[PDB]
Design a protein around this nucleic acid. Structure first.
Lengths: 142, 117, 154, 101, 7, 109, 54
RNA sequence: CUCAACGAGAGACUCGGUGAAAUUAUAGUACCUGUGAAGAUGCAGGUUACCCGCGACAGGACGGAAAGACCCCGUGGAGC
RNA sequence: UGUUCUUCGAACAGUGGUAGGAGAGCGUUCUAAGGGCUGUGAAGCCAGACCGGAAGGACUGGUGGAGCGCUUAGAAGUGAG
RNA sequence: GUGACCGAUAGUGAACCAGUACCGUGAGGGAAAGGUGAAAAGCACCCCGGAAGGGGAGUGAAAGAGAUCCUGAAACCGUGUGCCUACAAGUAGUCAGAGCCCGUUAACGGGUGAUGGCGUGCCUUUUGUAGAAUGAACCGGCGAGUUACGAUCUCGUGCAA
């Protein structure tokens, strides 16, 4: 009886700037955008969410002493395979997969989660190659 | 006298196997796993007939929250406004169909705006 | 029964060591050799009601046949020959088409040898009356001597 | 369109649309009316102080019938507890016309 | 004892 | 359409399907020559059934055998002969002498 | 060395995917045919490029 | 053995013919950390993983094979 | 289902459940009563999207080629994971 | 001569060359195995094939009735077809659910289902089992509260100190 969209979803493109916000508070909003929680036509099994582009990923910041205390782990399937780096080294070299690990942590787990991860595009600032899609600038709610 | 009882057993087995049609592998073929799958499906059917009544409600709450946040209010403020701006008992999936029939939802949202201040 | 089947008393295999069931007898009830612990047994189904119930039963079934107007009274049952054609003509003349009783006090041989080839007609003596023949045939042909016998007998 | 509650549940109906509601008797074949109409629509009239006067919605009853049969089987997964029960939910099918404001 | 001497 | 059935000849069905899955759907002129060269010794039996089907098409219906094609090539199982092989320590293992029904149906293309 | 569970029908059919055998390298015999497998003497005519050598 | 390296034959490998057995609740049958009848392929959270085979190893499936032989109980038995 | 009123019936209350106790029923074989289907096709088998609160029951189409069902009772070699 | 006795896993072990085959030195133990059609009228004749076995043609009411031969279920093995499957970690179901393919005992239709939510088989024994505690490879048949004589209680019927 209620509406449930399928193959009629219109997906927009959004640009999110990460110059002054946390890792962090923006990542939950980006995950909610990718899920489609901002649209009234949300249906939980058809991925009504839309594309988002994040620029200035190197300008991200995070409060406290997390630059030296937050540790990322990438354990292999080999014994003694625990490899670790700090948040400063992960931000300094390539913070793109920092942001994608944040979004992947806040996205749901499943086939739709891997599908909604594909709409995310994180780039080192401040230009993106998606000008042909004509993305609009999105301002964060807070 | 002697009772053989040959046909009613096979009638029961075929009723169970026809109830278990479409199942994977031997569960639509062998009786002794089909009966277990049918009983488990009965429990699952009762449980999910209970659960559909509330996950539909949470989907409608999500859609009303999205439509209200388009208009500057959260869900809780919108529902508090609907209980304050008269005793209107307008149910939530009719409120979700009201955004399929926009802008009727915006008028009720403005009615919520009017007496929250 | 399990003891009466033609079978040996040995066990087919030993108790432990083999990965099979125990199976102490060659023909246990779960075997193919049979099979029944209880079964049917030869017994008598006879029992006796008290005598007042018997007299009340026969008198009540006679009264229930009287109030249904199925009783026909024929004095002395005069039959000249032993032919069953005459008895069939007698039954036709009294409009009897279904089953019937013939109650005879003195047990005449001409009545007895006749009407036993007709499948629905049973000739019975006056003291040989019973519940089943009265409830079964739903019409009785009774002589005046048989009534004047069963009134003082029962 | 109008907002109708007669279940007791709220339904959204059009003109000439056949809907299924709970088994109210209605002496089938006879016109039934709804009197607790909210949010009359069309001109987008707000609802407040509910069951407003002038909100009358009539309908035509065609069938008193049975739903598809549900076999409600529940068993506890131990303890030899079995419970089998069929269900046959009655309904009323109406055709709604002449929405009044 | 728990001697593994199964035959 | 012509049909030839082998009906209880001594060959296991799983070994016959290994030839019948590839002989199915081909033209009959490109089907005997497949059977001659495989070798897979159920294939002379499949050849006998195939020539029987082609001869049934030629003699009983006159279907111009150069235009024929194999339509149905299913293999069924016949009755199994039960044999027992003695093993170590008195085990008496069972041996199944499998039997198959070879059926070949030919028709037009 | 003992199977814990029986193999289902679908797993058995998936294992029997590669059990099939291929069509041999059979070609037209230039003398008579038909047909003749490559790099072998024809069994029908007994010829090979192109003398009757049997 | 330090300390193992070649060579010969049979099996193992490939092809043709024939062709079993123990076992088996169904099975689309990953890993880590916990939880749980206190030691998880199936539970929770996370991390990984295209589909189907062939040749090998044996860590797990508290693997299979024998209603534990040890210990205890039976108002069981047998031998001395 | 239980209580009250009893003006077709209505109102109110209750209805998770092991061991166990109580009650009401569905099926199988045979027999007694009548009545009735059958080669213009019985039992059985196979399929269906039908009906009943359940055990269960009907109706169609195919196979089959000779018995079966209904009723009110009564007995049991009375229902299988 | 009769069964509110059995009907081929039943009834004698044995409805059939049965105390037979087979096993054991011996005493002894001890099976499995019925059904063409009313009438063999048991497929003359042709073709493939060495034969077996088929396809026609005949007999027959039926040949899918053709020698373990009435009917012929399920496990099991296959051949086609409609819909889904090569980024997916699943007691295999259930609820929601688009797409595609069909039309029913026309009924809020049937089949398949991308995707989401929930969800650790059945039984036994236990304080507690998804249990890494037990049992079952699967399917079909058989397989356990009966009967005789007494006693007690409830209900019913008959006659009532």
């Amino acid at each position: 009886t209620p509406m449930a969209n399928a193959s009629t979803i219109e997906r927009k493109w959004l640009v999110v700037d990460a110059a002054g916000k946390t890792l962090g508070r923006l990542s939950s909003e980006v995950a909610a955008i990718l899920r489609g929680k901002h649209k009234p036509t949300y249906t939980p099994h058809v991925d009504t969410g839309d594309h988002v582009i994040i620029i200035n990923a190197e300008k991200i910041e995070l409060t406290g002493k997390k630059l030296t205390d937050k540790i990322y782990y990438r354990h292999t399937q080999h014994p003694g395979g625990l490899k670790s780096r700090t948040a400063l080294e992960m931000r300094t070299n390539y913070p793109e997969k920092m942001l994608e690990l944040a979004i992947k942590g806040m996205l749901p787990k499943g086939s739709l989660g891997r599908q909604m991860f594909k709409k995310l595009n994180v780039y080192r600032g401040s230009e993106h190659p998606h000008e042909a899609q004509k993305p609009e600038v999105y301002e964060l709610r807070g | 006298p002697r009772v053989k009882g040959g046909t009613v057993t096979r009638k029961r087995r075929k009723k169970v196997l026809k109830l278990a049609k479409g199942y994977f592998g031997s569960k639509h073929t062998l009786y002794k796993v089909a009966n277990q799958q049918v009983m488990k499906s009965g429990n699952y059917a009762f449980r999910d007939r209970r659960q559909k009544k509330r996950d539909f409600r949470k989907l409608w709450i999500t859609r009303i929250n999205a439509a209200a946040r388009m208009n500057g209010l959260s869900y809780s403020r919108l529902m508090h406004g609907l209980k304050l701006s008269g005793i209107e008992v307008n149910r939530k999936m009719l409120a979700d169909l009201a955004v399929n029939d926009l802008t009727a939802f915006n008028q009720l949202a403005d009615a919520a705006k009017a007496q929250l201040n | 029964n399990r003891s009466e089947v033609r079978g040996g008393g040995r066990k087919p295999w030993r108790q432990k060591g083999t990965g099979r069931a125990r199976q102490g007898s060659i023909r246990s009830p779960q075997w193919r050799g049979g099979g029944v612990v209880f079964g049917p047994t030869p017994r008598s189904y006879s029992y006796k009601l008290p005598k007042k119930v018997r007299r009340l039963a026969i008198k009540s079934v006679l009264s229930s046949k009287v109030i249904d107007n199925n009783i026909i009274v024929l004095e002395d049952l005069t039959l000249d020959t032993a032919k069953t054609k005459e008895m069939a003509a007698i039954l036709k003349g009294l409009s009897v088409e279904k089953k019937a009783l013939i109650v005879t006090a003195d047990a005449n041989e001409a009545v007895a040898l006749s009407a036993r080839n007709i499948p629905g007609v049973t000739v019975v003596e006056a003291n040989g009356i019973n519940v089943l023949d009265v409830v079964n045939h739903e019409k009785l042909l009774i002589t005046k001597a048989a009534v004047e016998k069963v009134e003082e007998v029962l | 369109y109008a907002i109708i509650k007669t279940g007791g549940k709220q339904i959204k109906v059009e003109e000439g649309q056949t809907v299924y509601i709970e088994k109210l008797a209605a002496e089938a074949g006879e016109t039934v009316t709804f009197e607790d109409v909210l949010f009359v629509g069309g001109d987008n009239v707000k609802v407040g102080n509910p069951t407003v006067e002038g909100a009358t919605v009539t309908a035509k009853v065609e069938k008193q019938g049975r739903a598809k049969k549900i076999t409600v089987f529940r068993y506890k997964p131990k303890k030899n507890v079995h419970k089998k029960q069929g269900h046959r939910q009655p309904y009323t099918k109406v055709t709604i016309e002449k929405i009044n404001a | 004892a728990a001697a593994a001497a199964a035959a | 359409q012509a049909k030839a059935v082998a009906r209880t000849v001594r060959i296991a069905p799983r070994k016959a399907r290994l030839v019948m899955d590839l002989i199915r759907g081909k033209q009959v002129g490109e089907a005997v020559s497949i059977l001659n060269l495989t070798p897979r010794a159920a294939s002379p039996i499949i050849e006998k059934v195939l020539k029987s089907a082609i001869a049934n098409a030629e003699h009983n219906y006159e279907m111009d055998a150069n235009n024929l094609v194999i339509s149905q090539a299913f293999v069924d199982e016949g009755p199994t002969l039960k044999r027992f092989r003695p093993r170590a320590m008195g085990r008496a293992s069972q041996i199944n002498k499998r039997t198959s029904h070879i059926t070949i149906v030919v028709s037009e293309k | 060395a003992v199977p814990f569970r029986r193999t289902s029908k679908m797993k058995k059919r998936l294992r029997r995917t590669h059990f099939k055998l291929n069509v041999p390298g059979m070609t037209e015999c230039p003398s008579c045919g038909e047909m003749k497998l490559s790099h072998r003497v024809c069994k029908a005519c007994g010829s090979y490029n192109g003398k009757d050598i049997n």
